[PDB]
Amino acid sequence: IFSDWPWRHWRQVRGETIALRLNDEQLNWRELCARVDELASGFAVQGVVEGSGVMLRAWNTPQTLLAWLALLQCGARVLPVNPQLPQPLLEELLPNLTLQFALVPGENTFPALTSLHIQLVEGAHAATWQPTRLCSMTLTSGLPKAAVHTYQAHLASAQGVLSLIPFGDHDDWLLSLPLFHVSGQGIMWRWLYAGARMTVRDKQPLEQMLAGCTHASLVPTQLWRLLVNRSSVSLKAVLLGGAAIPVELTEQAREQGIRCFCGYGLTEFASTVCAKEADLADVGSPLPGREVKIVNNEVWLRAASMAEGYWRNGQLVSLVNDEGWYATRDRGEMHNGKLTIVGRLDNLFFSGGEGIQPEEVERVIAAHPAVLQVFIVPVADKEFGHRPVAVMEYDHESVDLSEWVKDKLARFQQPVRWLTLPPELKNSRQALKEWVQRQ
Numbered sequence: 487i488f489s490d491w492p493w494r495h496w497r498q499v500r501g502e503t504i505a506l507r508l509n510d511e512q513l514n515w516r517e518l519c520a521r522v523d524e525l526a527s528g529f530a531v532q533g534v535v536e537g538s539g540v541m542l543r544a545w546n547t548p549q550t551l552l553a554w555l556a557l558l559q560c561g562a563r564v565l566p567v568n569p570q571l572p573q574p575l576l577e578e579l580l581p582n583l584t585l586q587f588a589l590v591p592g593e594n595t596f597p598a599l600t601s602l603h604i605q606l607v608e609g610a611h612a613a614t615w616q617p618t619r620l621c622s623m624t625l626t627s628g629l630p631k632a633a634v635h636t637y638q639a640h641l642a643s644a645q646g647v648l649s650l651i652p653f654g655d656h657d658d659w660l661l662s663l664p665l666f667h668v669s670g671q672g673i674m675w676r677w678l679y680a681g682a683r684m685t686v687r688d689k690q691p692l693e694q695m696l697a698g699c700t701h702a703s704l705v706p707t708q709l710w711r712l713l714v715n716r717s718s719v720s721l722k723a724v725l726l727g728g729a730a731i732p733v734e735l736t737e738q739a740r741e742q743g744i745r746c747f748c749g750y751g752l753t754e755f756a757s758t759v760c761a762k763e764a765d766l767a768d769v770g771s772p773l774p775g776r777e778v779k780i781v782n783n784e785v786w787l788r789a790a791s792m793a794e795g796y797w798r799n800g801q802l803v804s805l806v807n808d809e810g811w812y813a814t815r816d817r818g819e820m821h822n823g824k825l826t827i828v829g830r831l832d833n834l835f836f837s838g839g840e841g842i843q844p845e846e847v848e849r850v851i852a853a854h855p856a857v858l859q860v861f862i863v864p865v866a867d868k869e870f871g872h873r874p875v876a877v878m879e880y881d882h883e884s885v886d887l888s889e890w891v892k893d894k895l896a897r898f899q900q901p902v903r904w905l906t907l908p909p910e911l912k913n914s915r916q917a918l919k920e921w922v923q924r925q
């Protein structure tokens with residue numbers, strides 16, 4: 487790509503085409519640039535300049551979306567913040583993130599930040615469009631880190647997604663996931679990348695939120711919610727992510743006429759890295775722009791959507807390792823161009839002198855049709871350091887698998903105890919470890 491602010495590009499190309507539904511109010515691009523203009527001008531009178539660090543603490547609402555466009559058009563570095571993050575955690579994070587303003591349309595409670603207010607004044611206040619300008623700072627989720635992205639990176643993310651998921655002139659993506667996550671940002675950038683339509687509507691049941699839309703992004707529990715309510719859903723495409731996506735979910739969805747795409751994404755990549763139409767264990771081959779490789783069982787990623795760095799103690803620190811890749815801490819395998827996530831390196835533990843990857847042992851056991859869930863959890867052992875324990879939820883009554891595993895797992899991977907998953911953990915690896923150490 488764009489030679490001007492995305493919303494102004496489409497204003498010139500297709501100005502009278504409808505761009506946005508905000509609570510059922512329809513705005514074409516010309517009208518949209520006009521509302522953003524009023525807010526961007528109001529922010530500038532209150533001190534927001536190119537590079538200002540601004541906390542946007544809020545849930546998705548039409549105001550929040552407009553405020554984002556306005557803040558960005560001023561050239562600000564936007565840190566959207568989940569209103570549920572507690573004040574003590576923010577008191578720890580904020581002073582290191584080089585912020586001067588807070589917009590909470592709640593109350594600002596951080597007196598080092600000047601309180602911003604939605605204010606309509608006259609003007610077309612805009613910083614000059616610059617794809618390489620810093621756009622956002624998204625919290626990862628120890629202390630959250632602030633992954634920083636340029637406009638260019640969000641646009642590269644969008645380009646890749648839209649190479650898999652057709653999204654065109656008439657289509658309409660619901661802003662279905664929070665803008666304080668990369669998921670909701672990705673929807674906004676896909677909308678703007680394509681110059682299509684987005685819908686933003688104050689909170690109502692998801693079934694109603696979806697009215698008139700063609701596309702949505704869901705976490706798996708949102709999709710389950712729709713299926714259990716037997717909601718009528720009429721979509722071209724749903725993109726799922728945030729976790730592994732069970733085959734049963736997508737089969738149940740397919741039966742309701744819901745075309746699902748499954749993605750592997752990360753905060754550091756401003757959303758989706760690998761993706762596929764729902765079909766197999768893998769997370770699909772890398773989206774165009776992205777590259778994947780496995781080193782010493784670790785998934786490494788490279789893309790134009792990668793964050794410029796993490797904002798540390800007032801400065802930008804690069805994400806990349808000595809080869810120019812991001813080391814994910816995810817354990818993976820590549821077969822036939824497709825990535826499979828085996829587990830998290832943070833869960834690996836040692837028993838004797840062997841590495842037990844819980845997720846691998848879990849997969850083997852879970853294939854037993856009596857088994858609905860299995861977690862493999864270390865417990866302290868003098869002779870061997872740790873030994874695996876199975877914590878199980880069975881389909882009906884429990885079954886003895888202590889023999890059935892002996893030809894499917896090596897000795898060091900076989901559980902030394904088989905326990906039952908308690909109600910307090912149905913619908914956390916530390917919690918399971920802690921619970922097992924009291925059993």
Ligand SMILES: Nc1ncnc2c1ncn2[C@@H]1O[C@H](COc2cccc(CCC(=O)c3ccccc3C(=O)O)c2)[C@@H](O)[C@H]1O
Pocket residue numbers: 663668669672673703704705725726727728729730731748749750751752753756757758759769814816827829830
């Ligand atoms: N498809 C997978 N298989 C298996 N493990 C996975 C996994 N997707 C993550 N994960 C795991 O969960 C970890 C972190 O996952 C995320 C954390 C923060 C942000 C995100 C991106 C979420 C996302 O961007 C999104 C969510 C809902 C709907 C659409 C989208 C989207 O726009 O792409 C993922 C990964 O490192 C993996 O260990």
